[PDB]
Write a protein that binds this ligand. Structure first.
Ligand code: SF4
Ligand code: SF3
Ligand SMILES: [Mg+2]
Ligand SMILES: [Mg+2]
Ligand SMILES: [Mg+2]
Ligand SMILES: [Mg+2]
Length: 548
């Protein structure tokens, strides 16, 4: 028997920073949480069986990343959809096991690789079992390392999903995903071995973000400096949220000539920086702020909303009838975008509904400038280097990552406002919405907020830093005039963090709280070896990061 109805602590908003045990703060109900645990368990067992075979295939690789992504915060609240994904994984595992060359020989397999269920009732019973819970790992430090690795792997999986959607892949990354999953089932490993896998997860996070950067830029062009409207026009619109640029491509193609405009929301803002989307005159602008304001902003938008990935919050009744899910997203009673076997999506029902809607309510007017991904910044490298050498830019501050609901995140807005006028903020991810409309101006034409894009575009921030390290002939990335004051919420941010640690970045400030899934001993290593610190007060952190 489980000791509580559920247990989940994977996001920054976990109850009391110790764990959601009755209902998720995010709205994930206990039955859904337990089914997500079973989906992860099923994926681990599939990984075991494929690793025993010695090879995988494309359908298994895609299933694994999609199943992991299904369990990221604010992606899927639909117990029925999670049950079908569990059944799909069991079928793939049973198919794989039927191909074994040594039926019986391999040492006793873990229960995740052999459990079965022939009805939804039996699936639900297994989901409610102790063995699938996070707390099944009894030692606190092993549990912390296993969960930290798992959440990093979920972040990798999400980015790899998007690359695969675009026709890109890297089987070495999938191999690592399977290795890491299997490691969490292996009681022979020491904490040092798990620590090494966490660092390796950072290595593969860099490789995955490199692959997604390649996929997005080869498909849609390199981001370029762009002014994005944050006001509204006078036509019915469709609002697209999340991160999938291929969904946007198809939505724009299908809305051309219809009288329905398209707007972006939250992590779709960076689509406006890509040449392939800038070409459409009905692509109006970015509506609203980050994900956590969506109940009010989706209502005010009046038109339909298409959610391509996280973050989805349980919808208000006012717009439930006009919000659609695609990809791995799910919520009971929300309509899906129809999709064929080749990944082509049909937005016809959305467009017909949009034509009947009022235009969006104006929330604000003005522009956001962005598009400073790696190609664009490297094209300005002489100007950037000259400003560093003259002291016109004294420090860069990476404030990338995720936004969220906690009012403690007012810290990030006030930190940005208190930064001296010779500093530049480098950003990516929806954390940007705490400071991207502040009107901070420019330094010799270089804006004081440089938005490289989506959270995956932290890759560009790394590429930029490594280019500056080479230009200045420095042996250590940390010798650059760069500070890190990163905000996190969901598991892609864990992958980004691990990527930065693998790249050698020290003294990161991580906030607005530190994860619940770090045990005291694991947190101590992060502090002592990597210099990780939580936020304090704006004034104290400006002093320690900028003025000392
Ligand atoms: S995803 Fe976050 S808020 Fe939701 S149940 Fe897990 S820890 Fe709680
Ligand atoms: Fe891609 S950054 Fe992480 S929190 Fe939900 S959309 Fe935001
Ligand atoms: Mg061993
Ligand atoms: Mg190539
Ligand atoms: Mg309404
Ligand atoms: Mg329906």
């Amino acid at each position: 028997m489980r000791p509580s109805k559920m247990f989940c602590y994977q996001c920054q908003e976990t109850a009391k920073n110790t764990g959601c045990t009755i209902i998720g703060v995010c709205g994930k109900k206990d039955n859904v949480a337990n089914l997500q645990d079973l989906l992860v368990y099923t994926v681990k067992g599939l990984a075991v069986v494929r690793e025993n075979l010695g090879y995988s295939n494309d359908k298994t690789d895609r299933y694994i990343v999609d199943a992991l992504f299904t369990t990221i915060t604010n992606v899927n609240f639909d117990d029925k959809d999670i049950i079908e994904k569990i059944k799909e994984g069991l079928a793939l595992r049973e198919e794989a096991a039927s191909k074994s060359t040594c039926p019986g020989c391999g040492g006793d397999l873990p229960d995740c690789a052999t459990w079965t269920a022939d009805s939804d009732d039996e699936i639900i019973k297994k989901a409610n079992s102790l063995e699938v819970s996070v707390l099944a790992t009894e030692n606190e430090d092993v549990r912390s390392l296993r969960e930290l690795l798992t959440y990093g792997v979920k972040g990798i999986a999400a980015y790899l999903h998007h690359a695969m959607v675009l026709g890109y892949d890297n089987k070495d990354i999938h191999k690592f995903i399977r290795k890491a999953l299997v490691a969490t089932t292996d009681d022979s490993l020491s904490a040092d071995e798990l620590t090494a896998l966490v660092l390796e997860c950072g290595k593969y996070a860099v490789d995955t973000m490199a692959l997604l950067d390649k996929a997005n830029t080869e498909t849609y062009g390199h981001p370029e400096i762009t002014e994005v409207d944050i006001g509204v026009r006078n036509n019915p619109g469709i609002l697209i949220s999340g991160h999938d640029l291929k969904d946007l491509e198809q939505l724009l193609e299908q809305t051309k000539g219809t009288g329905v405009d398209v707007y972006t929301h939250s992590e779709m803002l960076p689509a406006h920086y890509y040449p392939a989307f800038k070409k459409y005159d009905h692509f109006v602008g970015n509506y609203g702020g980050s994900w956590w304001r969506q109940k009010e902003e989706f209502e005010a938008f009046n038109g339909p909303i298409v959610m391509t990935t996280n973050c989805l919050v349980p919808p208000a009744e006012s717009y439930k009838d006009r919000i659609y899910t695609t990809g791995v997203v799910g919520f009971p009673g929300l309509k899906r975008i129809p999709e064929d076997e080749n990944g082509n999506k049909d937005f016809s029902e959305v467009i017909e509904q949009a034509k009947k809607c009022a235009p969006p309510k104006q929330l604000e007017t003005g522009k956001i400038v962005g598009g400073f991904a790696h190609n664009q910044v490297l094209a300005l490298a002489d100007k950037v280097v000259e400003a560093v050498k003259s002291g016109a830019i004294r420090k860069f501050v990476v404030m990338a990552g995720c936004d969220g609901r906690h009012p403690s995140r007012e810290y990030y807005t006030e930190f940005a406002k208190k930064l001296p006028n010779d500093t530049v903020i480098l950003t990516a991810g929806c954390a940007k919405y705490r400071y991207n409309k502040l009107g901070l101006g420019d330094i010799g034409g270089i804006p004081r907020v440089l938005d490289a894009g989506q959270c995956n575009d932290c890759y560009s921030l790394a590429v930029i830093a490594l280019k500056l390290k080479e230009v200045f002939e420095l042996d250590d990335i940390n010798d650059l005039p760069i500070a890190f004051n990163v905000a996190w919420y969901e598991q892609k941010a864990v992958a980004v963090l691990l990527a930065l640690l693998y790249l050698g970045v020290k003294d990161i400030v991580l906030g607005p709280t530190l994860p619940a899934f770090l045990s005291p001993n694991v947190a101590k290593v992060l502090v002592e070896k990597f210099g990780i610190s939580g936020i304090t007060t704006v004034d104290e952190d400006i002093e320690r990061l900028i003025n000392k």
